Amino acid sequence: LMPVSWSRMPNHFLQVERLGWAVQCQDPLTMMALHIPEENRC
């Protein structure tokens, strides 16, 4: 195993606070991903 490998920063992030510290989210977002069968990882 390697200690660290490179990675790519996504071009976008999710958009997201008182009275019990409420957190909201309303903008939907999606991303198309690959998958390897033998490695069983995305």
Next chain:
Amino acid sequence: LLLQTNLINYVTSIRPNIFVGRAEGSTQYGKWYFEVMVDEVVPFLTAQATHLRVGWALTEGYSPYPGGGEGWGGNGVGDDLYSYGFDGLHLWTGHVARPVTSPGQHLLAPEDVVSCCLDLSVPSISFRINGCPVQGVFEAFNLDGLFFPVVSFSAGVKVRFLLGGRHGEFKFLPPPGYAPCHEAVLPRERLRLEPIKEYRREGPRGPHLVGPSRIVLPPHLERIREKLAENIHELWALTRIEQGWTYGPVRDDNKRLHPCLVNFHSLPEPERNYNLQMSGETLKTLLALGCHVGMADEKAEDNLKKTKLPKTYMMSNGYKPAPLDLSHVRLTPAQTTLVDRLAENGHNVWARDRVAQWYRLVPYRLLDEATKRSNRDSLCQAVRTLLGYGYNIEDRVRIFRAEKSYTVQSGRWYFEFEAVTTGEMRVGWARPELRPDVELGADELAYVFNGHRGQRWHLGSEPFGRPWQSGDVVGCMIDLTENTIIFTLNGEVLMSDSGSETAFREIEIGDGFLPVCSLGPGQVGHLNLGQDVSSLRFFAICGLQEGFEPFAINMQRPVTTWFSKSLPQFEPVPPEHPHYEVARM
């Protein structure tokens, strides 16, 4: 056998700045409960069904990375062994959903309350439906690490927490024996929400990049014991006089009565004989550092003088105080911290007695900034008399870079970097095949400059330029035509020891070059690639009229900016390993 493809929406989790665990020390009773309710309006969004989960993580998951993960999507909890999940139908642990039976078999519908059960001695974690139990429990798990309340959620969901301190309205009753963050939770700061392992956060003008977050005894020693114990009685009498609260004729404990109206030896022994016991024990422990006290200066007893007492100063208490003058006596504040370790140890010993026998304090090293400083100041002003007597003593570095496609072979390019903090940062250029897991500029793969110490790094450090402070926007000239690399700081060219102008002359073109930046632990600062000339802080010193071009001058999209991961994935053994050679017979 062939690669597959589909669409997966993003997954992220949030957690408050609350920690808990069990170990030897200030355990804070380790008994706590968490209760939240959810209210969402997106039962089924466009692509898939939104998911919510509840559980805890032992500060070693670091699971949320926006993008791919160990399974399908970067799940928040329950996708590994460092988190747990409960979706209302199953229990999530390592991408395995184990179904459980309970009244109201449905997902986390809006306006539903949940509670979590935690056990510290025996591994036991359980949940609680609105008014129903759960037929499952988590048991026999390790506890190495602090636990924080974490919930996984998808887009479109709104939720609020409950604390019980200021605005926690607990609809459901607390469990019998678990407190809502009462004794000591984050005593040195406030409470709020924060993501885990956040390597990026939004900024006011532009997005910022954030780094990773972590008997036989000398007679002189014998006689001075009484010579210093009397000063302790003198100081306490002096403190009593300075208080101004004279002993009251009526004997009431609640009116701040003083039980010290008694002879210095006819007093009840247990309260003061033990009090003097620490005085000798603290002094003998503090001096137990390899230093032997000897009269090699004769500058202690000859200085014995009587302090001047005004007539009005003496009062009916009857105990004459002798406080030494402090109008010009100021030896050092540095050596006061030498006695801090014993006091913290003594308070810790005091803490153990207080907690062994619980309706409290914690280790003194991390109690709080305001009180610990005040207590240290209070302890310092009393132990200074001993010194005034005339006695002397004696978790990695993430790297940020653009992708290989934007490699430049010629021209004059320039970009700006801002250092919000003043930690260990480095800026420079690098070859396309920059191997990670190595220090920036340690090998020949980069020409990086370190502004924290005024050093340039290329196959070894070398002093160059002055150190940093707050602000200090820094740029980088470059010119492959004449093979020069030049740095600028706040509108001036850096200078070397020999007077050279960023001496990096005669550098081969190689495979082009590439901008690169690095961040040390606990550092904040963003870099500007010149998407538009406006965002550049100055661009009016060495780039405005010298033919230099901003890097992202003619782009319509932000640069990819590849970075470094943390998880140790698997790789085949390279055939050219220096000392690891495999052979197949």
Next chain:
Amino acid sequence: PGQQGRISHTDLVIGCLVDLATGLMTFTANGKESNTFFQVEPNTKLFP
């Protein structure tokens, strides 16, 4: 796993339950690390 640890790497065993838990067939399931420990197996003053 990385470094700074060689013991206690697997957790969160199965939590199966019954009406009375009278079934005498149970095991420490959910074992992520199906491993052994050879260093404690042999015992001799030699190098075979």
Next chain:
Amino acid sequence: PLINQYFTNHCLYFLSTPAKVLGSGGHASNKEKEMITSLFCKLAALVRHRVSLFGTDAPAVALLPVLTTLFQHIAQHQFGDDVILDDVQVCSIYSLGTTKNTYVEKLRPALGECLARLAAAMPVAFLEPQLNEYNACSVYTTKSPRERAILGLNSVEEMCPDIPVLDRLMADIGARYTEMPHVIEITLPMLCSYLPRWWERGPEAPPPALPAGAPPPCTAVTSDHLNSLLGNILRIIVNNLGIDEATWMKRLAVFAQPIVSRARPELLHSHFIPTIGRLRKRAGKVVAEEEQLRLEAKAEAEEGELLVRDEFSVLCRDLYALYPLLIRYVDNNRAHWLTEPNANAEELFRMVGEIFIYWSKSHNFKREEQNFVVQNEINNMSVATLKKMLPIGLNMCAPTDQDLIMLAKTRYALKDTDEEVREFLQNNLHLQGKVEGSPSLRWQMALYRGLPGREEDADDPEKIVRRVQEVSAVLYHLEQTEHPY
């Protein structure tokens, strides 16, 4: 081994941080006691080298009782006190040769730990003979009049004037400092404050000992209360600048003018924005070069047809003028050039006159190849060295960021500029004009902030070309700079 021993101390300069707490000071100070004892010990072995290595060894919880050489240090500096009185007459051996031993001691700006009880006794004891003998009085000139004044650091570790001159009761009987003198400190400089406004004399004789009187107070005032008093340095800039106006004459004193600028070239608020007079000094700065610009005309006329000895005309003229002028050139570019571009970047009219000037130096250097001979003569008076790098910092941003970033006509005239084209031929033949709004870098990199950056862009076709023609002419000389290297 005396020189050999100092090698370790010379090599070990970082001893201050991890070491040098109590062991160095106890023994290092005792070595200098040998110097005074061996001062009169004449011997074949050279003592100038012996004190040279010792001249570098001088810099090298609250209880410091081992210090005893501090008391013996008071008598050490009193050796030269009596010689100063005898220096009035000049005795055969008691002269300036024995005076050089006290120069090293006073230069301790960093290591401030002790007071040595010498508040102002020594400075006053030597200030009076320097001031009371301002006139030449037909006496031998001091070897280093400026060094002695510079030796006075404005403090030793805590110093404020007017303490012992007016107060003499508690001085010898019995802490109290920096509270008595409040409106008496600036009393003597005020008397000489009108001297620059009154020293209109041409020759340097009326200021016979100017380098010993003007420098020392100028640095003192800007040291104390720099962060609290801001108008004090305002008079400091005006005072020294007026005195340097006498340097405008070509040859007055080859040993006085260069020393003054190098003694104190630092400036704090001498920029044009806080000091508007600096903008007015451009006209004075113009006269420094414009008058010197016309000097080359005489050489060119005498360099026609070789009717007479050319070396008798060209060499005799530039030798007297260019020799001291080099101090003037570095005076403006020392630190004032660090503040001009900020005003120039924000506004194009800040230094138009200066931008349209200072090119005459390169114009003179274009011809008259003998200028390198006198330049070398001044180089060792104090490769591609700083001799030809003088205008690089001045021509960097001043002419390029002037106007019309995208015009694409200088490059075409650049080849014509390096073609011995006369000014009239350059002006008339290039009256066509050319421009193109291509979608290349000139579209966005240029005219998007080159024109908006200029708040009021001038509207004159040929006038802009004149600036381009003047700028291009300077470029045609840059090839010679690269050709030597």
